[PDB]
Amino acid sequence: ATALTNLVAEPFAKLEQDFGGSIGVYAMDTGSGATVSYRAEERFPLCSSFKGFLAAAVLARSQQQAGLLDTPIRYGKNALVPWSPISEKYLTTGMTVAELSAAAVQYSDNAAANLLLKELGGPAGLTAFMRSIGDTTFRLDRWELELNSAIPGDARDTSSPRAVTESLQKLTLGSALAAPQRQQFVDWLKGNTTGNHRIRAAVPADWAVGDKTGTCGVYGTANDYAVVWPTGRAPIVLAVYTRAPNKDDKHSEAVIAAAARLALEGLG
Ligand SMILES: *C(=O)N1C[C@H](NOS(=O)(=O)O)CC[C@H]1C#N
Ligand SMILES: [Cl-]
Numbered sequence: 001a002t003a004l005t006n007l008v009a010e011p012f013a014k015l016e017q018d019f020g021g022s023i024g025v026y027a028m029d030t031g032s033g034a035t036v037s038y039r040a041e042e043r044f045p046l047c048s049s050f051k052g053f054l055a056a057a058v059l060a061r062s063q064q065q066a067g068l069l070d071t072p073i074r075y076g077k078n079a080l081v082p083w084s085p086i087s088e089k090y091l092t093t094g095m096t097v098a099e100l101s102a103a104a105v106q107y108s109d110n111a112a113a114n115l116l117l118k119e120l121g122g123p124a125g126l127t128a129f130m131r132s133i134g135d136t137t138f139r140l141d142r143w144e145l146e147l148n149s150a151i152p153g154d155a156r157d158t159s160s161p162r163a164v165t166e167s168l169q170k171l172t173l174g175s176a177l178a179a180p181q182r183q184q185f186v187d188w189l190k191g192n193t194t195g196n197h198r199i200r201a202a203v204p205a206d207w208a209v210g211d212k213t214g215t216c217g218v219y220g221t222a223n224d225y226a227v228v229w230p231t232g233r234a235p236i237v238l239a240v241y242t243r244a245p246n247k248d249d250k251h252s253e254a255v256i257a258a259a260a261r262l263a264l265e266g267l268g
Pocket of ligand 1: 047049082083110
């Protein structure tokens with residue numbers, strides 16, 4: 001007999017009632033292969049969460065371009081956009097590709113993400129990297145900040161929780177990348193600073209977590225994805241995405257953390 005997915009689903013539905021929108025969740029236990037899935041194939045806006053996959057695409061590029069990571073990108077004023085706290089600090093000097101990548105992942109630095117997008121040939125460059133690892137769902141169309149609009153019905157700049165999770169698993173645990181680059185991706189995720197009230201809030205403090213958040217700032221639209229390493233057990237890969245129908249519906253970190261908990265607890 002298979003899982004009773006109605007029973008697995010029930011507490012997510014309840015959560016989304018008080019939230020006033022939609023929650024998408026996919027979790028995969030890499031030990032057992034068990035999964036939790038709720039609206040896991042619906043599209044949700046990526047917001048800043050594309051920046052993790054961006055860093056991975058940069059790492060993929062570096063495999064073929066020795067020293068790309070230690071190459072400084074020296075930029076002007078036009079690179080800068082709000083929510084770019086690290087790239088703003090280094091305007092007068094520049095930042096290496098590695099530094100920009102760390103800033104994109106760990107501070108969700110907007111300007112740094114746009115600078116790296118330019119290196120890959122724009123949003124379409126990153127989408128093409130995702131297609132190269134078999135993600136047919138992911139689509140990044142625009143740049144920071146336009147990609148944050150999160151307008152109801154817009155398929156631009158979205159993916160599914162499931163596709164996010166499968167791609168995250170390929171890049172962090174599978175061999176999609178070479179082992180040094182894979183470790184570098186994990187290290188960047190592990191050092192994220194913006195995720196303490198989301199998936200990390202659901203995980204025992206002594207378990208290692210790498211994550212990337214997104215917060216569009218409208219339409220209740222926010223997210224997190226992560227790899228979790230329970231001590232002495234196979235890692236878990238999961239993604240939690242939200243949206244809501246009104247522009248002024250608040251997003252909620254508590255809801256994200258609650259959905260992560262339900263997902264993690266439901267794996268077996
Ligand atoms: C991305 O979604 N961002 C970047 C920035 N940081 O928030 S995040 O949730 O940590 O990713 C502010 C909100 C939004 C923008 N712009
Ligand atoms: Cl400029």
